[PDB]
Design an enzyme around this catalytic site. Structure first.
Site, PDB file in Angstrom:
ATOM      1  N   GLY A 162       3.175   6.985   8.827  1.00 32.81           N
ATOM      2  CA  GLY A 162       4.589   7.075   8.501  1.00 32.81           C
ATOM      3  C   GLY A 162       5.357   5.803   8.840  1.00 32.81           C
ATOM      4  N   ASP A 172      -0.231  -7.630   1.856  1.00 38.79           N
ATOM      5  CA  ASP A 172       0.337  -6.287   1.767  1.00 38.79           C
ATOM      6  C   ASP A 172       1.864  -6.270   1.803  1.00 38.79           C
ATOM      7  OD1 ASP A 172       0.413  -3.540   1.662  1.00 38.79           O
ATOM      8  OD2 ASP A 172      -0.201  -3.259   3.760  1.00 38.79           O
ATOM      9  N   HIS A 232       0.801  -1.223   0.000  1.00 32.85           N
ATOM     10  CA  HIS A 232       0.000   0.000   0.000  1.00 32.85           C
ATOM     11  C   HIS A 232       0.838   1.280   0.000  1.00 32.85           C
ATOM     12  CE1 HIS A 232       0.539  -0.054   4.467  1.00 32.85           C
ATOM     13  NE2 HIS A 232       0.502   1.256   4.291  1.00 32.85           N
ATOM     14  N   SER A 278       4.164   2.648   8.197  1.00 31.29           N
ATOM     15  CA  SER A 278       3.864   1.633   7.184  1.00 31.29           C
ATOM     16  C   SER A 278       5.087   1.136   6.423  1.00 31.29           C
ATOM     17  CB  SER A 278       2.862   2.172   6.157  1.00 31.29           C
ATOM     18  OG  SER A 278       1.535   1.995   6.599  1.00 31.29           O
ATOM     19  N   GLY A 279       5.107  -0.164   6.140  1.00 37.42           N
ATOM     20  CA  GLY A 279       6.207  -0.745   5.391  1.00 37.42           C
ATOM     21  C   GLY A 279       7.381  -1.116   6.268  1.00 37.42           C
TER      22      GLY A 279
END
Lengths: 58, 239
Positions: free
Chosen positions: B187, B98, B53, B189-190
């Site tokens: 911020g 994801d 995402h 995410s990932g």
């Protein structure tokens, strides 16, 4: 203009910090907001130009 | 992998500042101007794993060896992205699967502050209650991001306990953690969710989604790496 242009910006449940544009009918211009990365609503554009072309004047 | 040259000091909303360079695999994903939009984890010198995402493109850059994003003098590595491999099974509706892999144009120079995190085996079982750690430059209050890298220790949650809140929104390639006084936020995410496997930090989850207000009493949802690692290995083997 589409009614989705009158909806407040929607960040969504994902935790990203992605700059997107939304139309602010109160001010009459497209402003930036932080999008979370998923489940975007329609008043969410990748450029100010796209936003103005779609929601300008709503 | 999974062994920082600089040991972290344990004990993101309500987390704590990390010891500089103690999470060497943590990278910052930024646009051409230096704007941080997501975190990521180095799995080796040429690849970074992040969330699907995050929508990374070849125009974005991987920043490794960073601690204080407000320090223009700090020595870091701005790495260009050669190709982006988004998992074709990523469901943009349910947010399942994801995960995305980033192949660097030029390999990262591993060092005291830059190295890889370990990947788990598809069959690994990280028991619920296990205390793991997540890191990132996401908001510390639900506002601008903190300059210095943050960290937080949090427990893995069983799918049954997670579903007690999120119900059927929890899918097979998702694992939950948190609801313990801390929370991943805008911020993060990932970024990584790591747990020790034989003493080595291993990527168990990838910051994905959760509370729309980053509530610390709500379960955080991460991409379950054990359910996606075979896809990772295959992608590396073919590229």
């Amino acid at each position: 203009r589409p009614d989705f242009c009158l909806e407040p910006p929607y960040t969504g449940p994902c935790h990203a910090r992605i700059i997107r544009y939304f139309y602010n009918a109160k001010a009459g211009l497209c402003q930036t907001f932080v999008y979370g990365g998923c489940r975007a609503k329609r008043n969410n554009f990748k450029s100010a130009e796209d936003c103005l072309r779609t929601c300008g004047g709503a | 992998c999974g062994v920082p040259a600089i040991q972290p000091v344990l004990s993101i909303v309500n987390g704590e500042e990390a010891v500089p360079g103690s999470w060497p695999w943590q990278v910052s994903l930024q646009d051409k101007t230096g704007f941080h939009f997501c975190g990521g984890s180095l799995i080796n010198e040429n690849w970074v794993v992040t969330a699907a995402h995050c929508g990374v493109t070849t125009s974005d850059v991987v920043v490794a060896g960073e601690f204080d994003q407000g320090s223009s003098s700090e020595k870091i590595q701005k790495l260009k992205i050669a190709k982006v491999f988004k998992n074709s099974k990523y469901n943009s509706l349910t947010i399942n699967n994801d995960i995305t892999l980033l192949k660097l144009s030029t390999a990262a120079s591993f060092s005291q502050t830059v190295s890889a995190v370990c990947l788990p085996s598809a069959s690994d079982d990280f028991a619920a209650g296990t205390t793991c750690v997540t890191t990132g430059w996401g908001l510390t209050r639900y506002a601008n991001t903190p300059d210095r890298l943050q960290q937080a220790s949090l427990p893995l949650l069983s799918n049954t306990n997670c579903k007690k809140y999120w119900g059927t929104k929890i899918k097979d390639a998702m694992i939950c953690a948190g609801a313990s006084g801390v929370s991943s936020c805008m911020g993060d995410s990932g970024g990584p969710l790591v747990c020790k496997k034989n003493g080595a930090w291993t990527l168990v989850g990838i910051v994905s989604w959760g509370s729309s207000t980053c509530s610390t009493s709500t379960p955080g949802v991460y991409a379950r790496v054990t359910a996606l690692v075979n896809w990772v290995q295959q992608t590396l083997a073919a590229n």
